[PDB]
Amino acid sequence: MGPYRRLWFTLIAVLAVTFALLGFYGGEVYRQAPPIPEEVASADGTRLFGRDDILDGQTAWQSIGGMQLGSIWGHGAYQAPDWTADWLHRELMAWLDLAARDAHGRDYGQLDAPAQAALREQLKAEYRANRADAAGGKLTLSPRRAQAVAQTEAYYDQLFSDAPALHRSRENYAMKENTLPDANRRRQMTHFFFWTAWAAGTEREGTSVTYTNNWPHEPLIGNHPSSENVMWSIISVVVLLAGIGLLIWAWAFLRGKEEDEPPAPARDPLTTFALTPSQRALGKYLFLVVALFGFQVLLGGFTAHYTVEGQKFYGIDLSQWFPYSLVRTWHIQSALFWIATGFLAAGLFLAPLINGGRDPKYQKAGVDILFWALVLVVVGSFAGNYLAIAQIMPPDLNFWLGHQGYEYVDLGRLWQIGKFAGICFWLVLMLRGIVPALRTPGGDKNLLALLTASVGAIGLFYGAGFFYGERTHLTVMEYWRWWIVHLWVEGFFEAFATTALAFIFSTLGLVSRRMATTASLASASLFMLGGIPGTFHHLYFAGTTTPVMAVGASFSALEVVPLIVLGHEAWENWRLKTRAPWMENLKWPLMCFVAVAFWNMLGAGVFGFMINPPVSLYYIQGLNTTPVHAHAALFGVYGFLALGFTLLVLRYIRPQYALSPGLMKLAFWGLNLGLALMIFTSLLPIGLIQFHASVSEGMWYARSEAFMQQDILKTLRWGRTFGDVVFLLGALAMVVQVILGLL
Amino acid sequence: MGPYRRLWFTLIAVLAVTFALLGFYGGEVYRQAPPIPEEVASADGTRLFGRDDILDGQTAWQSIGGMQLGSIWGHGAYQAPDWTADWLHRELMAWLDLAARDAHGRDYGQLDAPAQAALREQLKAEYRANRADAAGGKLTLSPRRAQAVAQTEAYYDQLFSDAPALHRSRENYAMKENTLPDANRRRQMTHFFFWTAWAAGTEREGTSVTYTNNWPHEPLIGNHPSSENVMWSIISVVVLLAGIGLLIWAWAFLRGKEEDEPPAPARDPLTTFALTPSQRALGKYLFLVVALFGFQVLLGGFTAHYTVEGQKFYGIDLSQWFPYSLVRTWHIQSALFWIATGFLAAGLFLAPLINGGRDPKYQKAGVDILFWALVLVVVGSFAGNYLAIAQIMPPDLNFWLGHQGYEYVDLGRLWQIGKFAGICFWLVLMLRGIVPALRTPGGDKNLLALLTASVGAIGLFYGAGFFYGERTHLTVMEYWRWWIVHLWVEGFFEAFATTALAFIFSTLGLVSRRMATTASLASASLFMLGGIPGTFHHLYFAGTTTPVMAVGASFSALEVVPLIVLGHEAWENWRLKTRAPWMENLKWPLMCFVAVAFWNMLGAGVFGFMINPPVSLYYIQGLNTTPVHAHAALFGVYGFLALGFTLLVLRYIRPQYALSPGLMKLAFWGLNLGLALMIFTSLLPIGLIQFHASVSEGMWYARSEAFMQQDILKTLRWGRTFGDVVFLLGALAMVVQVILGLL
Numbered sequence A, B: 001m002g003p004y005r006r007l008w009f010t011l012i013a014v015l016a017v018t019f020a021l022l023g024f025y026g027g028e029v030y031r032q033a034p035p036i037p038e039e040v041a042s043a044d045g046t047r048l049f050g051r052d053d054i055l056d057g058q059t060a061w062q063s064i065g066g067m068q069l070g071s072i073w074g075h076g077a078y079q080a081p082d083w084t085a086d087w088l089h090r091e092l093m094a095w096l097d098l099a100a101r102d103a104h105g106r107d108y109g110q111l112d113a114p115a116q117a118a119l120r121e122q123l124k125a126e127y128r129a130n131r132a133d134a135a136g137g138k139l140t141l142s143p144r145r146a147q148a149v150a151q152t153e154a155y156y157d158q159l160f161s162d163a164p165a166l167h168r169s170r171e172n173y174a175m176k177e178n179t180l181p182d183a184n185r186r187r188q189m190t191h192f193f194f195w196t197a198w199a200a201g202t203e204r205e206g207t208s209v210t211y212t213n214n215w216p217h218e219p220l221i222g223n224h225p226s227s228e229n230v231m232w233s234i235i236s237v238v239v240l241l242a243g244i245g246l247l248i249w250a251w252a253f254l255r256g257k258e259e260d261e262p263p264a265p266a267r268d269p270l271t272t273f274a275l276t277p278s279q280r281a282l283g284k285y286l287f288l289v290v291a292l293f294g295f296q297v298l299l300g301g302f303t304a305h306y307t308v309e310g311q312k313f314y315g316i317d318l319s320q321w322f323p324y325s326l327v328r329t330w331h332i333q334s335a336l337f338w339i340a341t342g343f344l345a346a347g348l349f350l351a352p353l354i355n356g357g358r359d360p361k362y363q364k365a366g367v368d369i370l371f372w373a374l375v376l377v378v379v380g381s382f383a384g385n386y387l388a389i390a391q392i393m394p395p396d397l398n399f400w401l402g403h404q405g406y407e408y409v410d411l412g413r414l415w416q417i418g419k420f421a422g423i424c425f426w427l428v429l430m431l432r433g434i435v436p437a438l439r440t441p442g443g444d445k446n447l448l449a450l451l452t453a454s455v456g457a458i459g460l461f462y463g464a465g466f467f468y469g470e471r472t473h474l475t476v477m478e479y480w481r482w483w484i485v486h487l488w489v490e491g492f493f494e495a496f497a498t499t500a501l502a503f504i505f506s507t508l509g510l511v512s513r514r515m516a517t518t519a520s521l522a523s524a525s526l527f528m529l530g531g532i533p534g535t536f537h538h539l540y541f542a543g544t545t546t547p548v549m550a551v552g553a554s555f556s557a558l559e560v561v562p563l564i565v566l567g568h569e570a571w572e573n574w575r576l577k578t579r580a581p582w583m584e585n586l587k588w589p590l591m592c593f594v595a596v597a598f599w600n601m602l603g604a605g606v607f608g609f610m611i612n613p614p615v616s617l618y619y620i621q622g623l624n625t626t627p628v629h630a631h632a633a634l635f636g637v638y639g640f641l642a643l644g645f646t647l648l649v650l651r652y653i654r655p656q657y658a659l660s661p662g663l664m665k666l667a668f669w670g671l672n673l674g675l676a677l678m679i680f681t682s683l684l685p686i687g688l689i690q691f692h693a694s695v696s697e698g699m700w701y702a703r704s705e706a707f708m709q710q711d712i713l714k715t716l717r718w719g720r721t722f723g724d725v726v727f728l729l730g731a732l733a734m735v736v737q738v739i740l741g742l743l
């Protein structure tokens, strides 16, 4: 439509190509998944567990916290070990002991190296084979492997059962003391752990890669990164460099240098409109954003104390009421809640201002219903997490209200349905402001159609957090989980907070509908080419095949290439301040939108491609260079956009309040300096020492308590505090600034 | 000096820091070199070879062609196998056979896998130990290893001695039939090969890395990329991305947008000066450049026929007179000669024009003496290579006049002394034109001091091609060799062909001494920060330690970072064409300087960092992704700069000759399209298949004749021709254009 027939058709073609690339390979993720075996049995014929016990153990694992206690297939928390690697290493060492007993009379560690090599070559014939019975439903594992599985079952039966022998192992893993009051639930959760470490051990039918693409790096069964893994890794590095260079070449040559130089108006154009009640009802939203932000930084500082200290916290223990999984669940979920609530507040700010300057019918009541629905969803979700991790809750009603166990979707399915209904109600309150400004027979729907499609994308695509039930397959709950963590949080918050920012900078008269639409459709098609099928860089090592990794390496090297080139759209945007005299009221939001760009190249670009290619992520998935990228990209991009929109909507609803520079200097350069201080001095060197240990000895070694208490990694995570107090001072100054602004 | 006290002191500090980094680590490359053992002996006490026989075999290996027949420690040609990996694999398989004989009565391939693992764990106790006797001079290797060495000695005694059993192995390796008419020289060259495959096999004193940093990827002795290898590789990738992004951030913000917009003069300022004899004597130089260029493309097409076909060439064989090593020696050396001669011609063009418009005293005679000295050096070097590879030369006088054996320095030491004396005579003829324009008491020495330092650097730094004699240590001949291939060819042709280009574009009045000096000292200090201590990415896997690799990964990620950002200085140096109406006479040089930039990001940036980091180069050093980078970076950067400086000096010595567009379109878009066609369709897919085979089975497997005749790699190098005829038509059109211009 309009004079944008090239850019709009490019955007639609990119959307269709990348969504066909998601659908055709999601069918494969669905059909090339590792089979949950119907009846596991020993070779003699005794009846071991089945797929019903494996899925009941999966539900029991979801009850204890799930991916907030430790990792499964690399995806989880990072204090407790990854259970599919720790179970694998303990089962392999039990098999090596039971193979050295009836062959040499000793253990594995007492034998000489030509005997240990002959035993490991016996390991790589039983574990890298003996898969399912080809739709026969049986497994039929060896009696030595049966005794090894039943021998390592006792370790996790004593680990989650308050045994005093495995005390000082639960303090190094930050687990609470009891952690499972039932005895059948542990006995089934070890069956679930065996299934996750059996899918990670046995090859496929016809290939030399396992079901998790050779993942948990184990030299005992010979788990090394495969051939096409390294091929697509070096192809992705070539694609990254020839993407950055060809993008700079095509920008410098194929550009239209018009230099129209549009003049800025002499008055702030959003102050000519009136203070309607739907604008004034956003003080509760801007209070909830910084309240959840202060709560989130406090819970982040509280879940970092279980890493340094044990489970005591300077006296009597509160780990029986607030364990590490609960405060980490809250520290993740309230982060997602305030980041979504800041963008919802910015949308509800822009929604009456699109439709002239007036509200639609029944708008303030809808804004109030939406605010109290969001507060009810937060409070009910946190009460459900507390009731599910403390096990004061029935396991029949654990998934619906309680804890889902998977990170970034930890809130229960009833509260997830409530959050999706609140997001659809915000979609209704957005379209009721946009559609009466598009139903008029005019020619004003140039950028507003892109904003309408972006609002529909951020509103409707939380429904992909369904299509996985309570006891369904784990690979399907790691394909539809990243549809709403990579495609919606990363992909459709960027596509909303850039086009709404372009609409704001266009309505102020600073950009003039040609750098607000051609530079906002090209900046929404460079990202949907590498962001929509880049979802597969989370599905490398979880039940998928080699072409999923092939798509997710190449089409995620192509989303770093418009992020490294962010000198433009960081100086372009920065200049806008030096274009009008009334822009000094918007100095501090326009500074955050500069820092948004900086942590969009350092957080998502440099540290996003450090862990991206499939031979680098192999030794990294589950280590401490993932919270580097997570803290630098979720707070540095979407946690400064939501604090830029908060201070922009603090203006034009409290227009007589100056932002008081001297406090906002602390609130900006405490957050930025603390984020750069707690990442570059504590998280990244720990992650690099873990990376050296994970490439040296194995994935089990980087997560084990013999390595995470190495007395150099004790002081290096004790050194979180010298960046953490700085981050807490910056976040506290931002909170006090917004509260003093709201009254 | 002048108003450039910041940039000049930055350049001097970068020079001093990177040259201290070269000196302090070159001392370590001198002292941490692998020892040539004084007396190799078996365990019983029989006297095997010594270091004198090893160095005489090194001289014998230099006599046959050296690094133009096959590789040693990764550095060499790519048709014949790498001899330190092929000797290593044959010695290991001979040891495995002689260890399976007296233990099971069978061979290695007939045993089951728990016996083969127990034999390989016996391999990694004798080969990864038993180094030198700690300044005792002895080696004292096992009698099983002695029989393995004497058993694999017969294979290379039959390989280089026209044996009919190893015929069709010499046609797959492109070696000529006889290749060594002596019998003691082969018997010592196998001792040299044993030393190169013994240094690459045994660990150091105290560490788990071998003397060549674990290099030839062999799962038998467990040669894998080490821990700090992978650590400094991922640190180099982070340094690359945070160099590109921070460079774009510091360019977009810390820039002075003055927009002075200097006007171009109405007449071409290099035509106001007169045609002196020192300008008119450059027709011989511009004839020699394109004569050696046509000869070089013909010899490249002739050394690519020994890869596809055997040693016959469509009838009776000329491999006895022109083998693969001789035509490859010529194809490399005449490439270096015409690339240096084009820059010498551009310097001799600029040298009288700096000193007003007049020649100094005795200038045309000096130009004629220099031209005939260069022609004598080319003819004497090629006759020496022909007499040394055919063995119609005494071995006492082989290194001085003959073949040095090391690639890019293949011409003999007498001819190398003659080439260095010609380069110093060109230094004299340059300074005789520059210094009388600097001895005047004025204020014109702004850019000319940088040009003087650059001309002194390109003149004096060929003397680092000395400091290695005839029989000196191979690691020292791989540290002082790359002082004049990486630091002088790559580092001081770029620092000469950019500052002379800035001087030319400043003399025309197109840039105005502020984009010709601030953009030429910043473009000469971004490159000397990653170019001067980046020399160590050629010294990873040749006798060096881990900190040499640590310097060469980090300080060579920092030389890709000003090469990927080449949209600027490719559009800045093309905008000019539209600046003046008389610029249409310089359309085709200014188009070549555009393509210079393009292959400076695709040839040196994308394909230069594809093979750069020490875990990627480990599986690549010696494969067919090195001629990708070599053909794209030596011709695409320094072979289009020397053809831009040829067609620029074709003007202003033949000013009445229009460059005839229609033929120059063929000469440009045949060279560019053939270089992009013979790289992306034949060399890079062969290199990627070899990379997959080198990460799968080993370094011996990627080079062996069982893999290079795999019938998919036969047609894929047979498909060189469909880009080769296009490159030949482009080079032929350039040759005919310059010859028709010169008369």
Ligand code: HEM
Pocket (backbone or CB within 6 Å): A076, A077, A078, A079, A296, A297, A300, A301, A302, A303, A304, A307, A328, A331, A332, A335, A336, A407, A626, A627, A630, A631, A634, A635, A639, A724, A727, A728
């Ligand atoms: C002083 C401030 C903070 C501290 C001390 C802190 C600390 C932590 C800790 C200890 C973890 C768990 C690491 C593990 O699993 O072992 C974590 C995870 C996480 N934090 Fe924070 N945090 C802080 C601020 C923030 C902020 C502002 C955000 C903004 C969105 C955030 C988002 C996250 C996320 C997404 C994770 C999950 C990472 C993952 O699971 O891989 N954090 N943080």
Ligand code: HEM
Pocket (backbone or CB within 6 Å): A074, A075, A076, A407, A489, A490, A537, A538, A556, A557, A559, A560, A563, A600, A604, A605, A608, A609, A611, A612, A617, A620, A621, A622, A623, A626, A629, A630, A633, A634, A637, A638
């Ligand atoms: C722009 C905003 C971005 C945000 C907010 C973001 C957020 C996150 C978070 C929170 C995680 C942690 C997942 C977990 O805890 O299991 C993650 C993982 C990951 N991110 Fe990003 N990301 C962003 C951009 C990128 C980009 C551009 C890349 C490009 C390659 C990338 C590469 C990765 C990879 C490979 C992982 C997998 C690590 C793992 O699963 O352990 N990210 N991302």
Ligand code: HEM
Pocket (backbone or CB within 6 Å): B076, B077, B078, B079, B296, B297, B300, B301, B302, B303, B304, B307, B328, B331, B332, B335, B336, B407, B626, B627, B630, B631, B634, B635, B639, B724, B727, B728
């Ligand atoms: C039709 C044109 C050409 C053809 C067919 C060709 C072919 C070849 C061949 C077959 C090799 C040997 C590969 C091996 O060692 O196995 C080679 C090496 C080389 N060629 Fe060319 N070439 C051509 C043009 C050029 C040009 C114009 C240059 C400009 C400087 C050049 C520079 C080199 C260099 C430096 C090497 C050595 C690479 C190394 O040793 O790693 N070639 N070329």
Ligand code: HEM
Pocket (backbone or CB within 6 Å): B074, B075, B076, B407, B489, B490, B537, B538, B556, B557, B559, B560, B563, B600, B604, B605, B608, B609, B611, B612, B617, B620, B621, B622, B623, B626, B629, B630, B633, B634, B637, B638
């Ligand atoms: C700009 C002009 C450049 C030229 C003319 C050039 C030339 C060459 C040549 C001819 C070789 C072959 C060496 C041999 O035959 O043994 C080589 C090797 C290599 N180049 Fe470059 N290069 C350039 C830039 C770069 C850059 C910027 C990098 C940055 C990382 C780089 C990385 C490498 C590496 C790692 C090797 C080692 C491959 C091996 O030794 O087998 N090159 N270069």
Ligand SMILES: [Ca+2]
Pocket (backbone or CB within 6 Å): A075, A076, A077, A407, A626
């Ligand atoms: Ca995580």
Ligand SMILES: [Ca+2]
Pocket (backbone or CB within 6 Å): B075, B076, B077, B407, B626
């Ligand atoms: Ca070479």
Ligand SMILES: [Fe+3]
Pocket (backbone or CB within 6 Å): A486, A490, A534, A535, A537, A538
């Ligand atoms: Fe992602």
Ligand SMILES: [Fe+3]
Pocket (backbone or CB within 6 Å): B486, B490, B534, B535, B537, B538
């Ligand atoms: Fe180099």
